[PDB]
Design a protein around this nucleic acid. Structure first.
Ligand SMILES: Nc1ncnc2c1ncn2[C@@H]1O[C@H](COP(=O)(O)OP(=O)(O)OP(=O)(O)O)[C@@H](O)[C@H]1O
Ligand SMILES: Nc1nc2c(ncn2[C@@H]2O[C@H](COP(=O)(O)OP(=O)(O)O)[C@@H](O)[C@H]2O)c(=O)[nH]1
Ligand SMILES: [Mg+2]
Length: 349
RNA sequence: AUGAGGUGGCAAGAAAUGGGCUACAUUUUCUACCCCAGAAAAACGAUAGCCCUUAUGAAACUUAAGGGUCGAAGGUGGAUUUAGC
């Protein structure tokens, strides 16, 4: 196999080859966001070989040819269910992290808009709501991912947490992040502050921010959360959602924004719906317009053959008839070269 | 008048019994979806009780639907017994 960890080597000629994430990179760059099925696959194989695909290569080429002076260009990976949008976004995230960018990764925007029973009224803004658990978990993950720049960045304004507690201007962003992580009740606010800070620092040229949000359509969709009066809650009424909406605006420069659509886990969306407009909604498409959509599709014959060979070399296909050409054709037909269906099918052979 | 007509009224539970529904959950519950999800998990569980509204009606206390409230018995059940090629 092409067991390669260098992100500056793989290119169009490496389409179909493999790209290895080292265990240190797996632990640091990806404390979250990796699909659970691939998390299990990594934990079993003891490897993190991502197949290099054309959409990921195109996104990498665009990010290499971009200029940070320009306002943040929005890229949107989209495709059919289980085509590899999340893992393409993860590949781009890892490449950018190795490029010493600052990775602002959202593992799943759907989690913040569904199944939350610890919602509280926001002290900073009585018209909004706070999700302490989600914010605390994301703050921990963000501190893990971007530790090296966490202390270097200086905050630009003084922020207050209580009548007694406040964060002074010029303090490290690590102070705010650790305040959010430890003091869970304020964590949501800290999240917004961090985002705000990052944005202006991106404008200041302090670093090269890469905003990575999976399931971006959840920002402008619908939330299943309810009020204390059993009333539905609009997405903008959540502080985290509003802050992420502000971050999605292209009114800042110093990097680029990369998002991945995901009907899986979305609310009030038909199963077969995958197109950008249908998943995003009119408001979502208007907010994201303009953007560059990148289509992620099923494996080609070369990619499917490479995946099958990778499974065989790891002895995952334990069935006796799997190495035969007939078994390969059966798997290709029953999966239609779809990466998720193929992996799920091979998980029990 | 053992005929005819009008007004009003029963119909409850000590209790046993037959049949049915819902369940006693994790192959489950909630939500989206209508099958690649996220949560819940000592909660699961009433179509019961009480209150309110609505529908029908001349009339609802006695009907039905919905909502609020309550969250109980129950934790896969003896001999026996039903049905299905
Ligand atoms: N480049 C790749 N190399 C190896 N496996 C891949 C690749 N892309 C996708 N997969 C497989 O796809 C599955 C996960 O799919 P993924 O989450 O990336 O796609 P998706 O369409 O964005 O998903 P979802 O709609 O659920 O958000 C895993 O089983 C993983 O092995
Ligand atoms: N607790 C606290 N939170 C802050 C402070 N400053 C900013 N924030 C957070 O950062 C966000 C501020 O966004 P802001 O720039 O005011 O956007 P706007 O509300 O639309 O004007 C809010 O969601 C707060 O949670 C502060 O001084 N204290
Ligand atoms: Mg009588």
């Amino acid at each position: 196999r092409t067991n390669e960890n260098d992100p500056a080597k793989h290119g169009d000629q490496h389409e179909g080859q493999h790209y290895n994430i080292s265990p240190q990179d797996l632990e640091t760059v990806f404390p979250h966001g990796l699909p659970p099925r691939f998390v299990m696959q990594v934990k079993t194989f003891s490897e993190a070989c991502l197949m290099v695909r054309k959409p990921a290569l195109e996104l990498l080429h665009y990010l290499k040819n971009t200029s940070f002076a320009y306002p943040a260009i929005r890229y949107l990976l989209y495709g059919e269910k289980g085509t590899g949008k999340t893992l393409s976004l993860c590949h781009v995230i890892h490449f950018c992290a190795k490029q010493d960018w600052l990775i602002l990764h959202i593992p799943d925007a759907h989690l913040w808009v569904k199944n939350c029973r610890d919602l509280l009224q926001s002290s900073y803004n009585k018209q909004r709501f706070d999700q302490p658990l989600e914010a605390s978990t994301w703050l921990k993950n963000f501190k893990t991912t971007n530790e090296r720049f966490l202390n270097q960045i200086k905050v630009q304004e003084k922020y207050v947490w209580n009548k007694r507690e406040s964060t002074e201007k010029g303090s490290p962003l690590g102070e705010v992040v650790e305040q959010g992580i430890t003091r869970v009740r304020n964590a949501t606010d800290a999240v917004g502050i961090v985002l705000k800070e990052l944005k202006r620092q991106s404008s200041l040229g302090m670093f090269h921010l890469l905003v990575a949000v999976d399931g971006i359509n959840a920002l402008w969709g619908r939330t299943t959360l309810k009020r204390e009066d059993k009333s539905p809650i609009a997405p903008e009424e959540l502080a985290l959602v509003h802050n992420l909406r502000k971050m999605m605006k292209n009114d800042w420069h110093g990097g680029a924004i990369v998002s991945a659509l995901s009907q899986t886990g979305s609310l009030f969306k038909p199963r077969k719906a995958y197109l950008p407009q249908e998943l995003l909604g009119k408001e979502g498409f208007d907010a994201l317009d303009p953007f560059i959509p990148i289509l992620v599709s099923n494996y080609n014959p070369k990619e499917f053959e490479s995946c099958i060979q990778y499974y065989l070399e790891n002895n995952w296909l334990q069935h006796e008839k799997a190495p035969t050409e007939e078994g390969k054709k059966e798997l290709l037909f029953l999966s239609n070269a779809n990466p998720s269906l193929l992996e799920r099918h091979c998980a029990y052979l």
